[PDB]
């Protein structure tokens, strides 16, 4: 199995949610209970007991979706994400994603909503009431490339990195888009 | 600069076209011409008697610039001259849509498909609609298993093929067996 000889500890989830995670771990050959991992919510919770390392269910679900065991340090959603709660810095924003799929995208969309943005599947230049699309204010992505990125450049709309989202999240303050343009990412 | 420490020959274009291309290379820190790193040639290619590191296409040049990345010319068959069996039109009754392709790569595939006698359509529809000005589609050309159009082709029983199908058609002068290039087998 993938989680062969790996012990886990699920923390901070609901009565049911704990069980679903515990299930999917055994279903890929891990053991439940010093533990190799401690699975906690995206926003992290109370971890008293000493573990190998604290990872998120986002890491977990991602790992299984690729059948690969990723390093938790290789993506900031894989470990608990700092958020300044109570803040809605993204209040008036309408966000699209590009180059993000599955669990990662569910999590980013989670954080975006948390900050009070609205998220849409479609990157949209002009609001169309009949179609149900509101004009987008931000594109969030990973590399330069693809049709969403090309529309952002053509429409003069900020196409920023994921770190823009996570920094706003950390400080509860809207990150300066110009400091996070994918246009300038190396 | 992106093309910094790189030297270029610009061969095969009209006077006005190569002036533009040369300026673009210069604007990206490249030098125009010893042995040049690159000879930029049109997609279909041209005589290059000078000796250069490698011969590359305008599609390479533009993509590279669009994504501010120095892609290895071997990473995409459109980056180096594409062999076409001249004057042959084996796709004369085809109506082709592309999925998952953007920008210069897409402008180039479009050119090729038209060149082979195909007609290229923005919208993938199963049935012609004269009022809307759209023709029934016959092929979908895409990069990976997934997305709206891919599902539609599966539903409509239309062939969904990798780009290699298109290029193999061009090289031979003959319509390649769609069943040897299905997206399901890649």
């Amino acid at each position: 199995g993938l989680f062969s000889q790996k012990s886990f500890l699920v923390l901070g989830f609901s009565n049911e949610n704990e069980s679903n995670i515990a299930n999917i771990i055994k279903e890929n050959a891990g053991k439940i209970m010093v533990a190799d991992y401690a699975v906690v919510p995206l926003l992290g919770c109370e971890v008293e007991a000493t573990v190998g390392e604290v990872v998120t269910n986002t890491w977990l679900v991602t790992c299984i979706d690729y059948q690969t065991l990723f390093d938790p340090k290789s993506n900031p959603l894989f470990t608990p994400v700092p958020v300044m709660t109570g803040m809605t810095p993204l209040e008036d924003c309408v966000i699209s994603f590009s180059q993000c799929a599955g669990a990662e995208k569910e999590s980013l969309t989670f954080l975006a909503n948390l900050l009070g943005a609205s998220v849409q599947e479609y990157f949209v230049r002009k609001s169309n009431a009949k179609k149900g699309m509101f004009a987008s204010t931000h594109l969030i992505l990973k590399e330069r490339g693809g049709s969403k990125y090309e529309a952002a450049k053509k429409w003069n709309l900020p196409a920023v990195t994921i770190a823009w989202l996570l920094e706003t999240a950390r400080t509860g303050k809207r990150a300066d888009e110009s400091h996070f343009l994918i246009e300038n990412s190396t | 600069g992106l093309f910094s420490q790189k030297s270029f020959l610009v061969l095969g274009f009209s006077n006005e076209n190569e002036s533009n291309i040369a300026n673009i290379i210069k604007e990206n820190a490249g030098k125009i011409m010893t042995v040049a790193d690159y000879a930029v040639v049109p997609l279909l290619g041209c005589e290059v008697e000078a000796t250069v590191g490698e011969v590359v296409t305008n599609t390479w040049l533009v993509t590279c610039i669009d994504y501010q990345t120095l892609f290895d010319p071997k990473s995409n068959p459109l980056f180096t001259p594409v062999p076409v069996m001249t004057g042959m039109t084996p796709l004369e009754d085809c109506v082709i849509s592309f999925s998952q392709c953007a920008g210069a790569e897409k402008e180039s595939l479009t050119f090729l498909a038209n060149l082979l006698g195909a007609s290229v359509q923005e919208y993938f529809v199963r049935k012609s609609n004269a009022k809307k000005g759209m023709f029934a589609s016959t092929h979908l050309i895409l990069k990976e298993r997934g997305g709206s159009k891919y599902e539609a082709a599966k539903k409509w029983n239309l062939p969904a093929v990798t780009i290699a199908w298109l290029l193999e058609t061009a090289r031979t002068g003959k319509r390649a067996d769609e069943s040897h290039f299905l997206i399901e087998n890649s």
Partner: peptide
């Protein structure tokens, strides 16, 4: 990006 998802 399996879908283009670009509008206007």
């Amino acid at each position: 990006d399996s879908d283009t998802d670009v509008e206007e």
